[PDB]
Amino acid sequence: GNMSFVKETVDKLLKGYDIRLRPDFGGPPVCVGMNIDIASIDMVSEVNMDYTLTMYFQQYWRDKRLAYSGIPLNLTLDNRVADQLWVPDTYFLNDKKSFVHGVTVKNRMIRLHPDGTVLYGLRITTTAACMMDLRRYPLDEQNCTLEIESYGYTTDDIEFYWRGGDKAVTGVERIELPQFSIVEHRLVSRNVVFATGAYPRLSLSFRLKRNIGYFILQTYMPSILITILSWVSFWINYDASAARVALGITTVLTMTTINTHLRETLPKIPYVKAIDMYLMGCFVFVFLALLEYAFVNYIFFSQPARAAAIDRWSRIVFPFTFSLFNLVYWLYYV
Amino acid sequence: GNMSFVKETVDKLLKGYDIRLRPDFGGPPVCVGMNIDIASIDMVSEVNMDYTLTMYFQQYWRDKRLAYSGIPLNLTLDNRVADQLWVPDTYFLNDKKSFVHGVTVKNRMIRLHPDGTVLYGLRITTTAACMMDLRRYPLDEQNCTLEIESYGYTTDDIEFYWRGGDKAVTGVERIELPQFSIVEHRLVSRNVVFATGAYPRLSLSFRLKRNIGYFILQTYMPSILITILSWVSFWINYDASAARVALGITTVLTMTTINTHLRETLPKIPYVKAIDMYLMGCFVFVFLALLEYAFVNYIFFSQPARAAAIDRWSRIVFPFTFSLFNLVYWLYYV
Amino acid sequence: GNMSFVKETVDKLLKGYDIRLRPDFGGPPVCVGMNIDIASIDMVSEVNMDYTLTMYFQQYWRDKRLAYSGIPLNLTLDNRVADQLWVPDTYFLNDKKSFVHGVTVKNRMIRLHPDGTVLYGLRITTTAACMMDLRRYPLDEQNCTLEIESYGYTTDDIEFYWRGGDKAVTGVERIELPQFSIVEHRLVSRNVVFATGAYPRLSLSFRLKRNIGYFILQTYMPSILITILSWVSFWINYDASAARVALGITTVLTMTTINTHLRETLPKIPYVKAIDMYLMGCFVFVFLALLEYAFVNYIFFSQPARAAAIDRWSRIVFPFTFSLFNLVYWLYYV
Amino acid sequence: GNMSFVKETVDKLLKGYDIRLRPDFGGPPVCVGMNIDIASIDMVSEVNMDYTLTMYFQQYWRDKRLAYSGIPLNLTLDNRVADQLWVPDTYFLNDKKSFVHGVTVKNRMIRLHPDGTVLYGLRITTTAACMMDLRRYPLDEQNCTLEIESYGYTTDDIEFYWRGGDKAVTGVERIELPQFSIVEHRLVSRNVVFATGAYPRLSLSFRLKRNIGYFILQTYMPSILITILSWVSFWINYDASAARVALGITTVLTMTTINTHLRETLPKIPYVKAIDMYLMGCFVFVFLALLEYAFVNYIFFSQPARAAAIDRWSRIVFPFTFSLFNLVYWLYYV
Amino acid sequence: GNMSFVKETVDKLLKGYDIRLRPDFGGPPVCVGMNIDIASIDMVSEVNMDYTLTMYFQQYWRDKRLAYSGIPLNLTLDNRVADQLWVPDTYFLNDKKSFVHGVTVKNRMIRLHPDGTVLYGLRITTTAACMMDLRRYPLDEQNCTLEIESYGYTTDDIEFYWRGGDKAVTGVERIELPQFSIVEHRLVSRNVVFATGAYPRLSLSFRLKRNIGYFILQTYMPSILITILSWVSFWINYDASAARVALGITTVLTMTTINTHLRETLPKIPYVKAIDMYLMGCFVFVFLALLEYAFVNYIFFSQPARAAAIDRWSRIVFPFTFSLFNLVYWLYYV
Numbered sequence A, B, C, D, E: 001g002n003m004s005f006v007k008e009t010v011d012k013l014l015k016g017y018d019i020r021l022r023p024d025f026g027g028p029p030v031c032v033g034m035n036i037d038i039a040s041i042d043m044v045s046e047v048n049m050d051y052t053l054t055m056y057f058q059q060y061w062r063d064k065r066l067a068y069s070g071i072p073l074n075l076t077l078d079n080r081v082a083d084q085l086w087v088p089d090t091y092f093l094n095d096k097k098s099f100v101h102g103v104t105v106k107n108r109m110i111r112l113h114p115d116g117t118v119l120y121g122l123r124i125t126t127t128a129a130c131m132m133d134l135r136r137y138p139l140d141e142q143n144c145t146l147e148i149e150s151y152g153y154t155t156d157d158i159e160f161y162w163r164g165g166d167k168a169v170t171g172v173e174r175i176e177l178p179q180f181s182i183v184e185h186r187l188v189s190r191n192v193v194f195a196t197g198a199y200p201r202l203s204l205s206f207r208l209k210r211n212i213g214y215f216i217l218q219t220y221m222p223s224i225l226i227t228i229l230s231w232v233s234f235w236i237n238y239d240a241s242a243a244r245v246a247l248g249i250t251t252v253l254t255m256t257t258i259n260t261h262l263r264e265t266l267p268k269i270p271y272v273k274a275i276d277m278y279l280m281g282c283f284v285f286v287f288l289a290l291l292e293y294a295f296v297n298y299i300f301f302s303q304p305a306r307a308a309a310i311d312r313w314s315r316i317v318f319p320f321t322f323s324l325f326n327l328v329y330w331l332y333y334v
């Protein structure tokens, strides 16, 4: 109630305070318990091999230099006072661009407790790198991790743990990814040894499964229908050479245009993927259909009966071979 | 009139002032009344699932430490003095990137009143996230919200309300969205409970209806005309096999090119939409027209009368089936 | 000549100076005269509905607290001293992103005069929003404004005027817009009333006329030539069904490809424009040509004379109808 | 050797130093000699009409307030001391975005000399605007300038010169532009008069010649080959109406696709260029070939001899007319 | 254990400390040993001719002014104390945009040792320029270097060396480039002479070999198959003029579309590359096939036997010539 007394207490707490020294400097390591409240996952980029994540990152520790008596209340201070206190050098190992929101003020919270306990909250949007294995794209399953580490202090000076256990990270169920579904999330705590010593490490891992309905409707069905249209030329009478030539070469042209526009629309992934293999298979099928028609046209004059036999064998074989190819493709990747 | 007296009064106000402590610290919560004057909505991005908004955000509260007597005037101070005063830790829950304009100076206003009242104005451009359900795109209706919350202080330390009631937010009628029309806007005040306690919450919601004229003129009419051109082959005499083959396969090629270029131009939305369903329906219709012509050509030699009957039945059926499909599509999504 | 005396004078000027108080605080409003020297207009974006502008913005006012005697010279001070003086809270009403150049130093100039006059110059690159009516695009004429306002001070505390009258803004004739020509520029001074009072307002308006030669050469001529090629099928003998079918459907395909690629290249404007109407007209013309050929082919067997009559009527009508359409289009939009 | 003595000397130099006053304030202007060591030219953008340049910019001047005695050595100080010294208000007239590199520290160098001489070095990446005349693109030759000026000080307070004469700017020969070759570079020194007085001006001009091999291989050869393929129809027998119709209309389609994709790939330049004229000429040639074939087909029945004469005249004329067009094009632009 | 004693020792160390003076100022140069722990290589851009690299950059030196006694421990201080100490002016010669990560705090580490030794660690993401010779693209091998230099201090004031020898740079084996494989990395130490004297220089060079499987599957195979389809017309009977004309011109159209879409997808490299040469060769082959068919069609009437001989010679020659072209191409670039 008396703001002058509270100001005197805070000034006494900050009088002689050395921000350059960690709590219990030269003694036992200071334990920092961390919790994450995930607000959203903005995007998951395959081209950049990363994902954007917005979260409330809260750190919990104890500094006996900040213990105060006579006030039976928790002191929620202005965020600017965080510039006058020691804070852990927590950073994200795999991030590429991170920032703290600063509207209207810096998205930062400092709460002090009578026993010297400090709660330090930040709102962070971080773009964390995620190496994605896109061999099975778009039927792939990815695993993206956020790594939390101390930068300068070793395990002799600081220790990390998930405050609250498996419930340390919340808001995962509220994540709305249009293209992915979060199968599972895991929390890991360990120590990692580098040339400068052992450092604490926390890990938050998500497992994402990609949705396939959009790719099925927009990437596979046109190719299947173009392959069927390529088959259509088999039932066309072989006397109409111009009609069958036009049909085959125009199916080839449609397949080429579809492949090029899909490659333009699909993420710029410079290695072989499942959808690329399927498109190549469809292109090879239409190419073989055109070659078969060419052979039939060439051998028609010498022996029309053999040409008709080849035509009917193509009618009975091409759908069967394509069905076998599709069965192999959809059993290998599923 | 006497600037020395005003300077003395301001120095006395700021002498002993503790920015780390909220007004009435340890007592009743400080009530903050907020008003928004929307200048513009820059863009609404479906790919990024967000919208950019520029506004004048004004906060109104009372700090008895700033009460001054002897000056029967309101003191409009330089914005820099805002760095020497306590301000609410107001932030936007769903924003992704926000900034305060700083040309020529920081777009900030501090006005003091004799009773200790503080008016604090900012000009903020914020990119607020908006989860959009694009199943009915481009006939969709969206609801985008701006959430305002206190970051560190709970409801025991601060309370939010819309100053002016339903007239707290102005400038909505002046918003000029080229692709959307603002059907309605709503103001909500409530409290939200998290693990750290209850926090005040204000919500400003807009309901947007997308315009359809551009999509009708540029996305549906070409598909309808290509479907009609596919129908055209039915009246063409079946003796000209090459002509009908070329017409059908070229209609298929035009449909594929139109679909690919629309997908390139349309926002990168990785799930099924209404326009995708319409394009797939048109593609299926032209595919079925080509298949019907192939069947007629195959059965023409064995029984020309049956081929002619199938041709005339196609003439009478394909427009009817397409009309039924269009009626179902335009009654389901409207 | 004596730098020690000048330093003493400047220190005396800045001794007891209160930056939180405007000149003549509590008295008459301080008049600020503004001049703009436009260096360039970087770009004019229709998609973003804005324009980038680089300028030298100079403010002129009087502060009696800075009046000095004994030095018969104007004091051009280091720009950093601007952080120790009161400056107007001038901002741009319609800007979206503005910055002051800072290489090698902050592009800022402070000049003091013996009578207390202050000249304050900045080099500002501002992206000002401009709502563009693109119904007549690319034959449109736009009007883009830059609005200058005081943020916190009302008309009782500050007044704005164009220093130099109509010659306040210079460098307009030197602006080199590749796609636009500046027809006129205007200067407006007024007062605008908001809920917090009346504020001064300056307005600098440009009228831009878009160049049409690029669009005429690259957007209209291909469509006209494709329409003529569609007409070409009328003179082709109707016995060659395959040739006319191929010509018509390939003209349709070329028109579709041209329209799609123009839409990709043209700015992403989500409403109807003049060029879209012209492209739709050309597409409708080629569609009607193909339909007419189909009708002629259908009725050729029953009555060849009527088919020939329809063919010659098409020959005499289609160019005439297209000429009427072009005349209406080029008289409506010009 | 004695760091305490050096620290005492530096403190004495900075004791009573007024950064707000230029050297020899109120007397003769301070002469600043400038040298540039160009590290690279990152890019030259026609769409943005600018070029990115990284350089070491060194300024040389004399400040008698910094003269020190007793130390027969040059004092290379930490860059942070530059914040405690007067520096020229040097800026780039035509730049759009410039910054000083700040990793690991700010890329800044301060060197003091016993006679008060100051050497001040910065590493600056500046995007300087360059108005490019693209009428002769891609056979164009451009001239891009970097302008250096004092912002606040006139010629009565500061003077600029190129330290070292024509050898002031180095590293030009090491510039590796993939698309341009630096024909020449020039240094200019002058004074420019504005409403606020006369200001010193330095200018560094580069003359760039664009390479043509990529455009010759990828932009002209396909058009020439498509024109030859259009000519091919002349030797095809006129009895095959379908074959010649298909060849002509497909050459037109290929030309349209090539033009559209080149326009997409080429920089977004909204006015007529040489390559656009060449593409239009090729398109007109194929259009005229198709029209000639149509006329031959129309007049074939009435008088086959005249049709054959027109066909052979086309065979002998079209290559000749195209050769004349190419000769005019390659003599006008070379 | 006693934090007050440690604070007293640190204050004594920083009392009288001059950050403007290097260690051993006026004496022997200070030796700085540098180590790099590469975390990742984000991207390698051919269009921008650069590569993004994230690393832990650690500098090791000795400052006798920071030597402390009585504490038999290494002092890991808060990163902010780095603003109160002298640090080397280390910068990257070829970088374009670099930054130090600042979440949650600035990614910076200061460790002091009793003998005055300072370890200074930063986490830096730098976009270093790399001039790439893309004549053999996509079969090219590149060499990208990171150059480390002192900005202001010469070799008389500072010396650089790789601390740990060839093991100074770690984490190279963990680099996961989707499109490149790191063949080798090298460390170089030398001195470079400029007009201002001799400066130390460290160099970290990577040799990258581009993967070819994606280009083989997606860029060469379609062209080869289209060339084979162009050959297909040779076996087609020459009586069907329309069929062969359509096949040849549609193969030309497919080749043009493939080339244009590859150019759109491929990096914007404005000079000749190997893949461009291969595409031009395939286009020339299909063009020659169409020309040969045209010649056969022209000479068929006068002498069918010669036309058949030319057709069979084309059948036996075109695959052979294409095989020779492919052998030359794949032996020249491999």
Ligand SMILES: *[C@@H]1O[C@H](CO)[C@@H](O[C@@H]2O[C@H](CO)[C@@H](O[C@@H]3O[C@H](CO[C@H]4O[C@H](CO)[C@@H](O)[C@H](O)[C@@H]4O)[C@@H](O)[C@H](O[C@H]4O[C@H](CO)[C@@H](O)[C@H](O)[C@@H]4O)[C@@H]3O)[C@H](O)[C@H]2NC(C)=O)[C@H](O)[C@H]1NC(C)=O
Binding pocket: A143, A144, A145, A184, A185, A186, A188, A189, A190, A191, A203, A205, A206, A207
């Ligand atoms: C995405 O991919 C990452 C890997 O790249 C996965 O991360 C791994 O997750 C597993 C758990 O699913 C981790 O395994 C566990 O590690 C714990 C930590 O081990 C360290 O610390 C202990 C001391 O506390 C040391 O002894 C040890 O050497 C390590 O230094 C262990 O404590 C766990 O052991 C417990 O469970 C196992 C069974 O799982 C029992 O057998 C044990 O007795 C004990 O009860 C366990 O081994 C693994 O370390 C993680 N790897 C990395 C690199 O972080 C993500 O899980 C994955 N994403 C998803 C969604 O799965």
Ligand SMILES: *[C@@H]1O[C@H](CO)[C@@H](O[C@@H]2O[C@H](CO)[C@@H](O[C@@H]3O[C@H](CO[C@H]4O[C@H](CO)[C@@H](O)[C@H](O)[C@@H]4O)[C@@H](O)[C@H](O[C@H]4O[C@H](CO)[C@@H](O)[C@H](O)[C@@H]4O)[C@@H]3O)[C@H](O)[C@H]2NC(C)=O)[C@H](O)[C@H]1NC(C)=O
Binding pocket: B143, B144, B145, B184, B185, B186, B188, B189, B190, B191, B203, B205, B206, B207
């Ligand atoms: C976009 O979508 C959002 C939701 O995602 C919509 O937001 C909802 O808007 C409605 C109003 O249209 C809100 O409903 C109202 O909430 C008020 C607040 O309730 C809180 O506080 C009270 C105490 O003050 C608590 O008791 C309560 O549990 C909550 O914690 C209520 O006060 C309102 O009740 C009043 O009106 C109703 C009728 O509407 C009466 O029955 C009541 O008696 C009373 O008079 C009301 O319930 C809702 O809370 C909002 N949801 C969220 C999540 O914010 C947007 O409206 C939508 N956009 C548009 C344009 O509609």
Ligand SMILES: *[C@@H]1O[C@H](CO)[C@@H](O[C@@H]2O[C@H](CO)[C@@H](O[C@@H]3O[C@H](CO[C@H]4O[C@H](CO)[C@@H](O)[C@H](O)[C@@H]4O)[C@@H](O)[C@H](O[C@H]4O[C@H](CO)[C@@H](O)[C@H](O)[C@@H]4O)[C@@H]3O)[C@H](O)[C@H]2NC(C)=O)[C@H](O)[C@H]1NC(C)=O
Binding pocket: C143, C144, C145, C184, C185, C186, C188, C189, C190, C191, C203, C205, C206, C207
């Ligand atoms: C782009 O579009 C904008 C509008 O969106 C145009 O801006 C308008 O420009 C016109 C001038 O061309 C302005 O009209 C003038 O306004 C002056 C200011 O009026 C205010 O202040 C006075 C007191 O000084 C008040 O009485 C008044 O109510 C306003 O608050 C007037 O002083 C002018 O009047 C003078 O000229 C008129 C004739 O034009 C005479 O009849 C009068 O007697 C008097 O001599 C005049 O009315 C208009 O205000 C501007 N509008 C806005 C919103 O700024 C741009 O011009 C346009 N771009 C281009 C290139 O034209």
Ligand SMILES: *[C@@H]1O[C@H](CO)[C@@H](O[C@@H]2O[C@H](CO)[C@@H](O[C@@H]3O[C@H](CO[C@H]4O[C@H](CO)[C@@H](O)[C@H](O)[C@@H]4O)[C@@H](O)[C@H](O[C@H]4O[C@H](CO)[C@@H](O)[C@H](O)[C@@H]4O)[C@@H]3O)[C@H](O)[C@H]2NC(C)=O)[C@H](O)[C@H]1NC(C)=O
Binding pocket: D143, D144, D145, D184, D185, D186, D188, D189, D190, D191, D203, D205, D206, D207
């Ligand atoms: C890209 O384009 C720019 C222009 O947009 C070119 O810049 C011009 O470069 C020429 C030189 O090639 C400049 O001409 C020279 O200007 C000097 C400066 O003149 C100013 O200062 C003097 C006093 O010192 C005043 O008298 C004068 O009025 C100016 O204010 C002159 O000193 C030069 O004169 C000398 O050479 C000429 C012959 O060239 C002799 O006749 C004279 O007697 C004397 O010896 C000369 O006139 C020109 O000023 C530049 N223009 C601008 C706007 O900067 C770039 O050169 C071009 N890029 C390339 C690569 O060429």
Ligand SMILES: *[C@@H]1O[C@H](CO)[C@@H](O[C@@H]2O[C@H](CO)[C@@H](O[C@@H]3O[C@H](CO[C@H]4O[C@H](CO)[C@@H](O)[C@H](O)[C@@H]4O)[C@@H](O)[C@H](O[C@H]4O[C@H](CO)[C@@H](O)[C@H](O)[C@@H]4O)[C@@H]3O)[C@H](O)[C@H]2NC(C)=O)[C@H](O)[C@H]1NC(C)=O
Binding pocket: E143, E144, E145, E184, E185, E186, E188, E189, E190, E191, E203, E205, E206, E207
């Ligand atoms: C990418 O491309 C760059 C060049 O652009 C390559 O960098 C070169 O790497 C080679 C090593 O592979 C360097 O050659 C070595 O330079 C050392 C430094 O020389 C300087 O300093 C010495 C004094 O210490 C001076 O005498 C000398 O004049 C230089 O100023 C030498 O010490 C090395 O010599 C040793 O090895 C050679 C054999 O290699 C022996 O003959 C010598 O006796 C001695 O033992 C050696 O010459 C070269 O300097 C680098 N060039 C540049 C510009 O940095 C990268 O290697 C390449 N990338 C990859 C992966 O290879």
Ligand SMILES: *[C@@H]1O[C@H](CO)[C@@H](O)[C@H](O)[C@H]1NC(C)=O
Binding pocket: A002, A003, A004, A005, A008
């Ligand atoms: C509030 O605390 C101050 C500082 O200790 C003290 O001087 C003052 O008397 C207190 N107020 C009351 C009402 O006791």
Ligand SMILES: *[C@@H]1O[C@H](CO)[C@@H](O)[C@H](O)[C@H]1NC(C)=O
Binding pocket: C002, C003, C004, C005, C008
């Ligand atoms: C310059 O001014 C200072 C301060 O007033 C004074 O002490 C000094 O004597 C003056 N110099 C001369 C030459 O008068």
Ligand SMILES: *[C@@H]1O[C@H](CO)[C@@H](O)[C@H](O)[C@H]1NC(C)=O
Binding pocket: D002, D003, D004, D005, D008
């Ligand atoms: C170094 O300079 C300081 C300051 O002048 C002085 O006190 C000290 O004695 C000098 N050192 C020596 C060895 O003379």
Ligand SMILES: *[C@@H]1O[C@H](CO)[C@@H](O)[C@H](O)[C@H]1NC(C)=O
Binding pocket: E002, E003, E004, E005, E008
């Ligand atoms: C810790 O160091 C301080 C400062 O030297 C000293 O006053 C204090 O007595 C020390 N503590 C102990 C337990 O000796």
Ligand SMILES: NCCc1c[nH]cn1
Binding pocket: B037, B056, C149, C150, C151, C152, C194, C196, C199
């Ligand atoms: N122009 C004063 C600030 C403002 C405008 N609208 C609302 N607030």
Ligand SMILES: [Cl-]
Binding pocket: A100, A101, A102, A103, B096, B097, B098, B099
């Ligand atoms: Cl932000």
Ligand SMILES: [Cl-]
Binding pocket: B100, B101, B102, B103, C096, C097, C098, C099
């Ligand atoms: Cl801004």
Ligand SMILES: [Cl-]
Binding pocket: C100, C101, C102, C103, D096, D097, D098, D099
């Ligand atoms: Cl800048």
Ligand SMILES: [Cl-]
Binding pocket: D100, D101, D102, D103, E096, E097, E098, E099
């Ligand atoms: Cl940088």
Ligand SMILES: [Cl-]
Binding pocket: A096, A097, A098, A099, E100, E101, E102, E103
């Ligand atoms: Cl970062």
